[PDB]
């Protein structure tokens, strides 16, 4: 460590500070709430009749599981853009006010 922080192969007599004492993690744990149902993917994206834009609808999404892979064989999109978050971390987070 000292040879490498000195950028030399020779060390001269003395005492040298090295990095703090590190401990490596042994396990990995995940703790999500107890949720069983799946989110209403088929009554939001598969509705029969939508609303016009001047009186737009607003549905409340409560305690459910967000599995958006179930849509992979039912509908294509052609516009899908996220803003506060990357699309590769959608099934690894919990969302508050949906």
């Amino acid at each position: 460590e000292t040879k490498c922080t000195l950028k030399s192969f020779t060390v001269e007599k003395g005492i040298y500070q090295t990095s703090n004492f590190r401990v490596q993690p042994t396990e990995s744990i995940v703790r999500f709430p107890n949720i069983t149902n799946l989110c209403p993917f088929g009554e939001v994206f598969n509705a029969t009749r939508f609303a016009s834009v001047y009186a737009w609808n607003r549905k409340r999404i409560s305690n459910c599981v967000a599995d958006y892979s179930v849509l992979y064989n039912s509908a294509s999109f052609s516009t899908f853009k996220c803003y506060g978050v990357s699309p590769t971390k959608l099934n690894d987070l919990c969302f508050t006010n949906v």
């Binding site: 460590e1 000292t2 040879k3 020779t10 060390v11 001269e12 007599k13 003395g14 005492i15 040298y16 500070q17 090295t18 990095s19 703090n20 004492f21 590190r22 401990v23 993690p25 703790r31 999500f32 709430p33 107890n34 690894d92 987070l93 919990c94």
Partner: protein, 171 residues
């Protein structure tokens, strides 16, 4: 709940209001969390802690070293245990043999303790302040010199350093 991290989880005494899930310290790092299944509060403490120093007699003489763990008290969070474990008010020193003598400081460990490459091995000792002396003081005794010596000593003092200039655009 999506918040990732690393550390040690322990049972807590903090008590959250029902609308709270995370707890933050002054540096704004998350240090407490409510478990989403058991609803119990946990403290999150970091994992790395404690300074480390390495004492070498120079690698042009030997690759023996001693290691000072400045936050350990052995009577462990160490890389190795070997032999010659010696406790100091500066930490736990591993790899150096404790002796009872006292010399001038060679490599200062700290808190009054020095180390040196003697007999080869590495030894650790308490530094000596100097030779002890006593003056034959009485209320009617004086000491007068009868000879002298002419002494010549050197004293070195820096007076200048190198004058440099820099071209921003070129650098």
């Amino acid at each position: 709940n999506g918040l990732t991290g690393t550390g040690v989880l322990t049972e807590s005494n903090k008590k959250f209001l029902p609308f709270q899930q995370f707890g933050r310290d002054i540096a704004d790092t998350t240090d407490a969390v409510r478990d989403p299944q058991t609803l119990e509060i946990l403290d999150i403490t970091p994992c790395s802690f404690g300074g480390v120093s390495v004492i070498t007699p120079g690698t042009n003489t030997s690759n023996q070293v001693a290691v000072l763990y400045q936050d350990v008290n052995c009577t462990w969070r160490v890389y190795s245990t070997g032999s010659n474990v010696f406790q100091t008010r500066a930490g736990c020193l591993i790899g150096a043999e404790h002796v009872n003598n006292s010399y001038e400081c060679d490599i200062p460990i700290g808190a009054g303790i020095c180390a040196s490459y003697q007999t080869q091995s590495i030894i650790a000792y308490t530094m000596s302040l100097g030779a002890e002396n006593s003056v034959a003081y009485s209320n009617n005794s004086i000491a007068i010199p009868t000879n002298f010596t002419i002494s010549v000593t050197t004293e070195i003092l820096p007076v200048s350093m190198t004058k440099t200039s820099v071209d921003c655009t070129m650098y």
